[PDB]
Amino acid sequence: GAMAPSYRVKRMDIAKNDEECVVNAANPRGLPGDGVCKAVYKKWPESFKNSATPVGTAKTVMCGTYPVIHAVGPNFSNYTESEGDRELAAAYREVAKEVTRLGVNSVAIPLLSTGVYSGGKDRLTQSLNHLFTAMDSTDADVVIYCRDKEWEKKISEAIQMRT
Numbered sequence: 143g144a145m146a147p148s149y150r151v152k153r154m155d156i157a158k159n160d161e162e163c164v165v166n167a168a169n170p171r172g173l174p175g176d177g178v179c180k181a182v183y184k185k186w187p188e189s190f191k192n193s194a195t196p197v198g199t200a201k202t203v204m205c206g207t208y209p210v211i212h213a214v215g216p217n218f219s220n221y222t223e224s225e226g227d228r229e230l231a232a233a234y235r236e237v238a239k240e241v242t243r244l245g246v247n248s249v250a251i252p253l254l255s256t257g258v259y260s261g262g263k264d265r266l267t268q269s270l271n272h273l274f275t276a277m278d279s280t281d282a283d284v285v286i287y288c289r290d291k292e293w294e295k296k297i298s299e300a301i302q303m304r305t
């Protein structure tokens with residue numbers, strides 16, 4: 143565990159993270175995909191051996207000794223708002239189980255289902271609150287990675303508001 147477990151946010155490529163493991167915003171078939179998933183495939187391609195896993199689950203594959211936690215959020219194009227919300231919450235609970243099992247002191251995590259799986263909706267608050275619900279009982283330092291300048295400010299505000 144971290145001595146004073148924290149949340150932080152950085153605006154940069156999660157493939158350049160400074161944490162002990164990474165969460166991939168994976169597809170269920172273990173395909174290279176787009177966005178975060180394509181960057182993770184380019185940096186840790188060995189971690190896509192038998193990485194396929196259902197929606198709402200996380201599966202860890204080692205790249206050398208570096209753990210890649212493949213977390214499959216729902217594609218809100220295909221799910222109802224209600225069912226998608228349940229699967230998005232479930233994916234983050236499985237990430238917390240993996241982070242705990244691995245014994246890491248830090249984890250790099252993207253906001254699941256906020257990009258090409260968002261169904262064209264802004265899901266920053268929905269995805270972030272499911273992240274907190276899952277990770278708050280863990281003692282790893284959590285570093286959230288984003289792309290958008292306005293998202294960085296909104297994530298930073300949500301973190302600071304609970305300190």
Ligand SMILES: CNCc1cnn(-c2ccccc2)c1
Nearest residue numbers: 256257262263264265289290
């Ligand atoms: C990196 N993608 C996250 C993101 C940024 N912006 N939005 C967004 C904003 C308004 C309406 C729909 C979607 C999602």
Ligand SMILES: [Cl-]
Nearest residue numbers: 153154155158
């Ligand atoms: Cl970058």
Ligand SMILES: [Cl-]
Nearest residue numbers: 255257258259
């Ligand atoms: Cl996404």
